[model samples]
Target: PIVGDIFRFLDNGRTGLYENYKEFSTELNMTRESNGVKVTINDVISDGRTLSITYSLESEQDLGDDPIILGGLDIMDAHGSSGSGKMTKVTEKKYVGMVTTTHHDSNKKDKVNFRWNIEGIEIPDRKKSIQGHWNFALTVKSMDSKERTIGGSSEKEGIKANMEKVAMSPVSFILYYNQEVSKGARKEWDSVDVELTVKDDLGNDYSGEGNGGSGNDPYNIRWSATFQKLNENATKLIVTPRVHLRVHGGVEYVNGKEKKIEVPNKEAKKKDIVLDDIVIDLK
Candidate 1:
């Protein structure tokens, strides 16, 4: 039963998921295009029926200078199911792709979190409205390595210096999920815990609800971490170890009063989330 149709496609479509926004800039600065940072998964909940629309692209935008090293997470489409196909054909469907590498510390390296578990997907029995519009895309690059000015200073040797350098390029993200799985044919979802937000003007306001007022008003701070399921030699999907979050609420009043923060399992009674630090070498 494809895990009960992924548990009725995640409890009747998570609850009206639709918060798509786009705006990445620097050509005009404007404080890096109004802060050039964004995150939106709208809604998607799962207990165990098959739910894995993983995602997590942190660092909160701003590669104009370079230093965000590698990144990518594309859940593509699977909202309701849309006959479970045709969003320009997502590679073949089956789902599960990831890429991550963040740690710079301009303020906790900006931040990036992702989780997945849409495992038991296999519901394709057309005939019914068919409405699943999923769209996702994000490409962030900056491994840091490229800054050339050579060296210049000569007002009769007044006082001037120049010799820049940098190297860090690898940031990517492509998001999109259009679903309509036959109006929810006993939908199903197993896992998905995304959390990668930021608010670093280094002034104050993170928006999560600090009320100190500074970074503008976004409150700044919505930390989250979850996603570790790669056994058999282990290779990807397993990040846990970098916690420091404190965001009361924002993003328009926590939307539906958002409440589901359970991430604690350093090493115990199956808190779930384990990655011994990654080690691969099967010679």
Candidate 2:
């Protein structure tokens, strides 16, 4: 089966990554062989926000029931985010996996270059390690998609925020929100309260968890979340923030002992914040 067959999907008579990468996928079909083992970059898909790659691995010997040691294997871009990956053994000698990387730098070139390194893999129950170093660089053309500014704002109780923008592409749905912490609020903004979910008009939930924060000042922090690609038919985006958690002071533990540290607003009432929907224009 083709590597992208599993990811192929149709909406209103359209295809998924398979069709998106089919034309240039042949250029990405590169392989590396070493020490009786081979690794191949079979398929890749990406947008300005994130990149995903699928690879295949094979060994000359039986790999046994143990999983491949992926701890030492990694992929990174010139911009510096480490890739996150997972693998599944297809047969005694074959395996397949996917790796993904997120980028924040908006000025990345039209062609982004990435490096993959596999230090080694452990054999049979991890009893021994076949140590080898393999390094290679892969490049893919960057794709452009429509980005919509879904400006929104909320001020309730003691919290205030601006849903600055949301951009959608075939490969990702990017959300940007700016939050301001009232000096009198209980705790500083540590991160965007994970109490949030995003979705498109197609009923497909792009609400995966990930919020990259950028603090503009001591009192303001920007939160951005990137989700899987949205279909072309997707028009409106709905963002809901459920339970906004503010970190009161945390207890300190020393030498198996605990002591409470009081900072401020111990009598403050905690409650969830219902944010307004930040709608984007995909048309």
Candidate 3:
């Protein structure tokens, strides 16, 4: 159950992990120091489909006054995919974060290459920022890939939804859906507001993360849900349609104060759109 333990460990930890990290990861103890702070790249988890790097930052001085912001973080693959990162302050002086990127042409390429860059760290309260330009170039080995396809369609009054596919790997579970909205229909909705849930045979519920969709087709908006746990006995996929109030860029907060931003030719009142829940059996 080593693999299972690793999966659980990654789930409980802030570090990003791949199922094949132990077999394919490069052993590099890379670190960059500037000012009174040091940043280190401890580990990498990449499988062409996704790229994840685990790193830590620590300051020699106390960082308890204001939040330390990491800036100019980017990850890129040879296939021309852009990436972003998220950091969490583990302690007053210590921090950990991960950068994620994807590779669509991983199967076609014999070797995969990645680039990691960090522009600097900023301490805004102290009016002091450390200019630590760090970059790491890496070459990754490909691993066996697997994707489980889940295909079907469900319809409402003005919308037709198709579950194009579901890619279930050991590292992650991704669900892709296509929504075709009728012309002249309201399309002002947030992608993450689309409510979806999955339950396994054991009645365990899994929520989606890192939701993304395509904007190529006006009428056809394709979206996906990334789930951390794969349902071994996936019983159903449930979706509820809802929209957030902040979708139209009419809301702003200033110094812990909330204010409604007024937009011309738009309704400021909150309106509820009634939609039925679409449930698809996944047995």
Candidate 4:
């Protein structure tokens, strides 16, 4: 329960927890100070593919409402690391933190030389920012190395997704798939917007974070979803893939007025394409 408490940010407050969630985490208590502000990397978790940290920031001056890591977190070895985070205002000058970084293409590499940093803090409401370097170079391993490859595919409404495989880290699971539009149907759509939902035999719903895809070509889009960790005790995972097609021109109702839309969102309305589900054996 304490592990879930530490990572409550994984699902706002109630995270779907792995049985050994505690084991996959490390407490660094690492602190750095700059410009009279203190930042601490208190706790950390990694599943090879995603890295998350719970931290604290204390400033002599007020940070206002929701202060954030300015310039965000950086994963130096990852080549390119992007982020999303959450923090609570513990006090006017203090905040509890949740910083995330997805280590793109890290699952296949065995050497887990995980390293990252946070450069500054900002209170968005007032644009109050402080300059500082809070760097962390950690030695954390992906919790589950025996990544599983699943064979399943689904086609719905001329859109096809080849459910490729899954990889699990401590805090999240990545569902991989390759998608293609139906023959001669490529002209109707621009971007493929897909969302994934995961449930387990335990009747728990793990929240989905975000996705990844192949470069440039819409037809050859290989997508991925990072969901909060599945319950280890659950043996079966039911995954539902929902897609939104950015189609050609159509008249849609905005508020009460009819609006003419074209090309994805030039005022173009989003249309949802339904699809079947896939079940994975969490053996």
For each candidate in turn, give its C-alpha RMSD to the true structure in angstroms: 25.0, 7.1, 7.6, 5.0
Clash totals for all candidate models: 65, 0, 0, 1
Predicted structure with the largest lDDT when compared to the true one? 4
Better candidate number, 2 or 4, judged by TM-score: 4
What tens-digit string does per-residue lDDT give for candidate 2 at 1-283?
4344323321113323334433433335578888888878777666555566777778888676765554333324434443456666678888767666766565434566767778787875758766776666767676765566667766653456677666656555667777666655636333334345767776877634353555556446666766656666777766665536543344432332235543334424343344644555565
Model 2 residue 274 CA deviation (Å) reads 6.9
- The weakest ten consecutive residues by lDDT in model 3 span 1-10
Name the candidate, 1 or 2, with the larger lDDT value: 2
Cα-based RMSD of candidate 4? 5.0
lDDT (10s digit) by residue, model 1, range 1-283: 1121221233222221211111111111011111222222322222111122322212232222212212233222322111111111112222111122222122221112323212111224322121222234332222221212222111111111111111111111111111111112212211211222221223221111011111222222222221111122322211112112121111222222357333332122222221111111211
Whole-structure CA lDDT of model 1: 0.20
In candidate 4, how many Å is residue 133 off?
A: 2.7
Provide the lDDT at 151 for model 2.
Answer: 70
Model 4 lowest lDDT segment of ten: 260-269
lDDT of 4 by residue, 36-84 (tens): 7887777776666666777777888888987777555655467445566
Residue pairs that clash (backbone atoms under 3 angstroms), model 4: 47-169
Q: What is the lDDT of candidate 2?
A: 0.58
lDDT of 4: 0.67
Error of 2 at 184 (Å): 4.5
What ordering of candidates by lDDT runs from best to worst? 4, 2, 3, 1
Off by over 4 Å in 3: 1-29, 63-84, 103-112, 187-193, 217-219, 233-270, 273-283
